[PDB]
Amino acid sequence: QGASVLFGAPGAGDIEVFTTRPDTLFGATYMVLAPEHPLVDQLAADVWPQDTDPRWTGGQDSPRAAIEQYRRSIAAKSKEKTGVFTGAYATNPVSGKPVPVFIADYVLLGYGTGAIMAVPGHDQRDWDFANTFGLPVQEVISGGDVTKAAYTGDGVLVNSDYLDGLDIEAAKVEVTRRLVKDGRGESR
Ligand SMILES: NC[C@H]1O[B@@-]2(O[C@@H]3[C@H](O2)[C@@H](COP(=O)(O)O)O[C@H]3n2cnc3c(N)ncnc32)c2c(OCCCO)cccc21
């Protein structure tokens, strides 16, 4: 079933996410917090990082500016995917890779922890946001074509280290076991 997963981020402690597909953790290429999530102000960087995409900034000169205008954007005129980058990168808890942290109103503050891991290869909501904003799309479930659409079907784990070859249900169990031993999550 589901899991609580911890993504460490510099200066912000852990960002906890709820996922029903922990098996897809090696395909989590970014993270999304609800715009009013309390850690966002802590996460905002002082300077857009080098590899910030201009589509990520709301056209603003700094992370805090983009965040403020995006929040303001949610009040005015309060569909398509919108959001901004915070400047922050969290540590993926199974691969160690950097995952950029966004805010976007498709993530509800009041559901779960108010934060998700985003797996565009296998969640069409995340696929849509990644295709609008230009985020990497990683296949970890064999069976479709993640360059055309999220693959939500059954298949075997790939590009996922000790999960490779596992069926999805077995992969959920194994990744959760590893998260528990590593202090990085639990079943929920
Ligand atoms: N996103 C990557 C991975 O994780 B998913 O997305 C999170 C989390 O799992 C899921 C939790 O929904 P349920 O409690 O009903 O089970 O919704 C999403 N979610 C959790 N909290 C959220 C929030 N606050 N706001 C918006 N979405 C949220 C997920 C999928 O969800 C399919 C089920 C959607 O109803 C399918 C494939 C891959 C995944």
Residue numbers in the entry: 304 to 381, 389 to 498
Copied sentences from the primary study:
Leucyl-tRNA synthetases (LeuRSs) are examples of aaRSs that rely on their editing domains to limit misaminoacylation of tRNA with near-cognate amino acids and maintain the fidelity of the genetic code. Here, we identified epetraborole (EPT) from the MMV pandemic response box as an inhibitor against the essential protein leucyl-tRNA synthetase (LeuRS) in M. abscessus. Benzoxaboroles were shown to inhibit LeuRS in fungi, gram-negative pathogens and most recently M. tuberculosis.
AMP acts as a surrogate for the 3’ end of the tRNA acceptor stem. In addition, R435 (R449 in M. tuberculosis) hydrogen bonds with the ethoxy oxygen of EPT and packed with the ribose of AMP. EPT has a hydroxypropyl ether moiety, rather than the ethyl ether in the benzoxaborole bound to M. tuberculosis LeuRS, but the extension shows very weak electron density and likely does not contribute to binding. The only notable difference is a ~1 Å shift in phosphate group of the EPT-AMP adduct. In both complexes, the phosphate is pinned between Y421 (Y435) and T323 (T337). The electron density indicates that there are multiple rotomeric conformations of T323, meaning its hydroxyl could hydrogen bond with the phosphate or with the 3’ O and ether oxygen of the adduct.
